[PDB]
Amino acid sequence: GAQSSEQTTLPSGLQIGTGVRPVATERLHSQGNLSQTNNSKDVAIKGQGFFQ
Amino acid sequence: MISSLWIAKTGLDAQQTNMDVIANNLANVSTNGFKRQRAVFEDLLYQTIRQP
Amino acid sequence: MISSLWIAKTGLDAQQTNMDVIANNLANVSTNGFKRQRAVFEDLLYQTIRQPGAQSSEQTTLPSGLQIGTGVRPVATERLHSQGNLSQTNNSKDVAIKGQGFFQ
Amino acid sequence: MISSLWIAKTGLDAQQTNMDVIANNLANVSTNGFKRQRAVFEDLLYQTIRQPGAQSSEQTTLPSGLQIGTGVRPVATERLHSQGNLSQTNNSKDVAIKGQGFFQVMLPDGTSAYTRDGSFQVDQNGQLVTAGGFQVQPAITIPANALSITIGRDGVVSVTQQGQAAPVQVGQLNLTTFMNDTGLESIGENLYIETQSSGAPNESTPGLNGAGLLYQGYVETSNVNVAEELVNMIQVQRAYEINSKAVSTTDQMLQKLTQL
Amino acid sequence: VMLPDGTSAYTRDGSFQVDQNGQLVTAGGFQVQPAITIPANALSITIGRDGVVSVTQQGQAAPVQVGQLNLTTFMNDTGLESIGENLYIETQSSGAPNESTPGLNGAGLLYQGYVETSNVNVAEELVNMIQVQRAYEINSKAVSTTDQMLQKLTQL
Amino acid sequence: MISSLWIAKTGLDAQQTNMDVIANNLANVSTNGFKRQRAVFEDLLYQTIRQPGAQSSEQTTLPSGLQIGTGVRPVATERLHSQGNLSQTNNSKDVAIKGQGFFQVMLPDGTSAYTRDGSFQVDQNGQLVTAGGFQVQPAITIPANALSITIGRDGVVSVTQQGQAAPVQVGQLNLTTFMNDTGLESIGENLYIETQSSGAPNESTPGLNGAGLLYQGYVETSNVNVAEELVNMIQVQRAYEINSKAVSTTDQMLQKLTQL
Amino acid sequence: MISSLWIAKTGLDAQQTNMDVIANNLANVSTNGFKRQRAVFEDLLYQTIRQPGAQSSEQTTLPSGLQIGTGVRPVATERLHSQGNLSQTNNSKDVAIKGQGFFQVMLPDGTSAYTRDGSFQVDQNGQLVTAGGFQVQPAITIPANALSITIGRDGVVSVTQQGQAAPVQVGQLNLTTFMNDTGLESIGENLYIETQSSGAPNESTPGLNGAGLLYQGYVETSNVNVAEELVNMIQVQRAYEINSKAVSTTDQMLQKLTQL
Amino acid sequence: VMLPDGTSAYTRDGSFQVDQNGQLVTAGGFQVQPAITIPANALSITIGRDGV
Amino acid sequence: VSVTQQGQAAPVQVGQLNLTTFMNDTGLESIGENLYIETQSSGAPNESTPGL
Amino acid sequence: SFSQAVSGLNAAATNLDVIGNNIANSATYGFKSGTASFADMFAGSKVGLG
Amino acid sequence: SFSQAVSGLNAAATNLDVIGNNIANSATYGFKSGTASFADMFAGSKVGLG
Amino acid sequence: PNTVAPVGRLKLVKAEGNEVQRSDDGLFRLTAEAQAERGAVLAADPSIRI
């Protein structure tokens, strides 16, 4: 964008870039398929809650 | 490991429950004052990839 | 990391979704009042390269340019709301539907 | 920096394009009304050096002089607009084309697109829309409590109401035909838009002017034939491998130049 | 094939497409000579053994002849100038382009639904690459030997 | 990319065509008035190399020169026009042909197709129609007050009204015959249309100069033979597998060469 | 640039030609009236260097001196003109040959070609033609109202008309025999033409001095033996392996000389 | 190509860009004559065989 | 040199390619453009039909 | 060539459905049997669709 | 051996069809029973064709 | 490329070392004795190839 001449501008100048970095590791909080273990004590959640 | 495998395993277990019910019904033909069983099934969870 | 690999990855995912639909249909054979599912797919975006119909010379157009396409995506899962076979259980409480209504 | 390297690079790019087309064809096996793609290749420029036909002697000519060619580039991608095999889905809302016509739908922008896919639904308003929700043209609206929908071979859509012994007509499903079907621009979502190379949209009923016939309860599957795709994958892999070998040979030549 | 500037080129790539006004053209858009215009009411296009193009319209039980595919035969084929995009132009070594019907005057036949592929033999090219590479490595060594001889000579 | 690959890529396609013909024949094993298909193949190009019969010396000729050939192409699938077995399903509206003639039916667009299917119905207006709703020719109307329909061996359709001891003639059914029955173009729905290779439609009465005979209460079944189709599947499968093995051998040969 | 590399290249080309012949033979398995081809090779030139039989010493000669051979080249591909097994297609127009004769057809150019395939049809005018539409000579004209066509063992074509207990003869099918049957030039399309190495076409009746007997309802399938083709494919693959290894070994030797 | 002083030079480097007021310019920013101005709502720019 | 003409089951004889043999081939003068000219040490160019 | 055979399988299933329905109504006053009729789906000749 | 066996299969099928036609016409006045005659199809004398 | 036509022929002469002398501008010219025998201008030799 710098003025290359008195009446013109420089389009898309010289950008030399460095490498790549990892930003973040995100989890996919979705509903997994249910498995029945025939146990009176095992509980499964259907929506978007957590046990405390 | 795969959603299809879990669904098919669940279907297998349900049909095995139906077979067990049928076998128990057949085993008690000569019992007096017996009421035969019938199993009722339902659809499991439905993941909403794209909301209808 | 390369275009063909992404296209094939999308195809694999679509076929896996189809297999899940088939497995769900199989698991609910004994359920009462169940309507089977069917998955519908659509073809994904297109990399344009040469535009189809672009004027090459002053008078001659370019027919059917280089439309390199991407993979596939499933649009929807539709139920088949059709009257299933009625079974006689001879029970005073069991009710069956003959038309296209729903219980509330 | 060396000619053979650029030529083999162009060859590698062409083979990668062929593999891309192959993968796109393979990923769309289950897509309804999909047409397979084919790539067309052409020679690149030709360095002239000696002019073929130049005057070598006063009474002799130079036959077929030294023309040095550049690599290869794809000309264009052409579809195979042919009738795909029909599949019975036993659904009153699915229509299949037997000839060479297209359904006209309206995009949300107001412009019209064309699709050969017949998987239709009915929205909350009753208008016949596609699987993505685009409204067919015209708005084949549907009454409230329909019992059955009958779409004839000539596009007449009728609804059977209760207590009425005669079916009522609620629309007329028409087909659009083009001078050049390969010139339609694919935009995804099984949708083709008009271009200047696809002629003009000729609106017509099913059965006249060439337009195809409509079958209710059937869907037009893709025309992709797998065995051709497998043999072409073998071809693409081996040609890519040969071109990579040529690149490697050029690399060794240049390295030997560097050592001296 | 008729080029935009009006001069005729010649091609053997038989992949054709119908443009927006009918008309058979090459994949690059150049119109093929002579003229075949295919109407809208066409159901199937058949190109015969002798280049006759017939178009079947609905209702008619007899196909309608549209055009003739004329093959241009040269007497010295290799003398043509390759102008790039799968096209050859005539030169002084391939003069007198003879229009003919396919199958007559030595011309070839036409098979519809098939395309002639490249005649490049692959093993020959790989062995030739081996020969070329080793040859460029023996000439480079000759260069190095001459350089060393010169260095030894001019050093004294 | 190599010659044997193209040749074995034509072999695969020809065997796939043979399997398609077999599967289509087996799928329509029960449709009435069906004629099964047979695919025919022919040799492709033959590269001359050394010309056969070339004059090597001034007195010795070269016998059977180096004629390297290309793959195979199918000419066409021809319909095996034979008389299917007649079945007595005892309905007055089913008629079967005994010779080599065809029924003429008027298509909605005004043109005439030709069908050998004899399962006829009566529309709401009383005309004889094909089960697909196409009206037969030269139009045979049936009154509402009809007690019995009698179609004789000569195609005369008679209707007996109530309390009347004499039948009433309501038309005359005629059969169309062609010079070449194979050249007819099948348009589906058990319908064939005339093509220039099928000559011209010669209308004739059933028993004269070559039209067949009509039997009432009979249906003409298909001529497809299941056991022969099974054996042909077993042989086509083996041929396809062997050609695929040729493809694989070519692929392996190209691997070692490139690796070198 | 080095002799062993040229020799191994010639070997590779010969093995590729053998594989091409094998693939062509396997691609035409379903073709009727097809004859399998076999290629024959000859070794290339022999460098003289030391003339054998020369005087090794005043009283002795050199036994079997130093001859250095070049690669290999294919001489010719010979057909195997043998009777393939007959197949019953139960068609009145299919004709098979039991002996050593050929059918004669006329190309559109006016010249005469020869074909052994007997899958015949009838055109729109009534003449007996092949599957490619070429008219079988001598012209056999089938009339409009034919009921059955009978072709006997000696080549007489008879038509039985309606109401006439005697059959009407409408032609005479002859067979052409050549002294050298393998010398014919195959143009594809199951057609062979006469060359100067195939002698002259001798017309003869089918049953006379060596023309074969004509069977109606039979087709002569190809004589390709497939297990032999699989074994030969194994052989060709291994030979190509060994030749490629020779090329690679020569490549490794020249490398050490470059390094020198 | 139009130099800053106003005289016309000539180039064979075919790597062109477009600047912020439309207009085709070279990699250095000099504007190419004749003056070709690509609009903003462009979806795809095609440069034909004959320079159209 | 024989050629095949359409419809002609026989080839048409066009010409004979004669080979020239010298006595001392090593004495020829190599003039450049892959050509040898006769030199007094390689005289007597004898034309012959190849094979004879 | 998979859809072609799938269509034949569906036709055979429909025939067997009709036969089973007819058999189940062997003793049912006022019942009239059913019969399924089939027609091919040729597209442009030389190829079948089922 | 897949063309020599197919011929025998077809011959046996023809014989069985003839036998079935004889059985079906057990009660048909003026009917004459039918029989099938088979002959080999040798070629050279070392190559049988079925 | 059909337009290619001859325009002119370069003059190629044959001269040994003993006949030519390098002028002060580096261009060789015929010596006096050689010029007197071969003429003022050297005729083109048709045997010269370039």
From Swiss-Prot, chain E:
List localization entries.
Bacterial flagellum basal body
What domain of life does the native source organism fall in? Bacteria
Query: What is one GO biological process annotated to this record?
Result: bacterial-type flagellum-dependent swarming motility
Q: What Gene Ontology cellular component terms go with this record? A: bacterial-type flagellum; bacterial-type flagellum basal body, distal rod
Task: Say if the entry is tagged with keyword Transcription.
Answer: no
| Keyword entries, A-Z | Bacterial flagellum
**Entry's transmembrane regions:** none
- The answer to whether the entry has keyword Metal-binding is no
Belongs to which family? Answer: Belongs to the flagella basal body rod proteins family.
Quaternary structure and interacting proteins, as annotated: The basal body constitutes a major portion of the flagellar organelle and consists of four rings (L,P,S, and M) mounted on a central rod. The rod consists of about 26 subunits of FlgG in the distal portion, and FlgB, FlgC and FlgF are thought to build up the proximal portion of the rod with about 6 subunits each.
Q: Specify the protein name.
A: Flagellar basal-body rod protein FlgG
The protein's organism comes out as Salmonella typhimurium (strain LT2 / SGSC1412 / ATCC 700720)
Q: What is the lineage of its organism?
A: Bacteria, Pseudomonadati, Pseudomonadota, Gammaproteobacteria, Enterobacterales
Question: Whole protein: which stretch is covered?
Answer: 105 to 260 of 260
From Swiss-Prot, chains J, K:
Localization, UniProt: Bacterial flagellum basal body
The residues forming a coiled coil are: none
Q: Which domain of life is it from?
A: Bacteria
Q: Which family does it belong to?
A: Belongs to the flagella basal body rod proteins family.
Query: What name does UniProt use for this protein?
Result: Flagellar hook protein FlgE
Encoding gene, per UniProt annotation: flgE
> Which region of the full protein is contained in this chain?
2 to 51 of 403
Curated annotation (Swiss-Prot), chain L:
Q: Where in the cell is it found?
A: Bacterial flagellum basal body
Q: Superkingdom, according to UniProt?
A: Bacteria
* Quaternary structure, from the entry: The basal body constitutes a major portion of the flagellar organelle and consists of five rings (E,L,P,S, and M) mounted on a central rod. The rod consists of about 26 subunits of FlgG in the distal portion, and FlgB, FlgC and FlgF are thought to build up the proximal portion of the rod with about 6 subunits each.
So what family is this one in?
A: Belongs to the flagella basal body rod proteins family.
The name this protein carries in UniProt is: Flagellar basal-body rod protein FlgF
Gene responsible for this protein: flgF
Which portion of the complete protein is shown here? 152 to 201 of 251
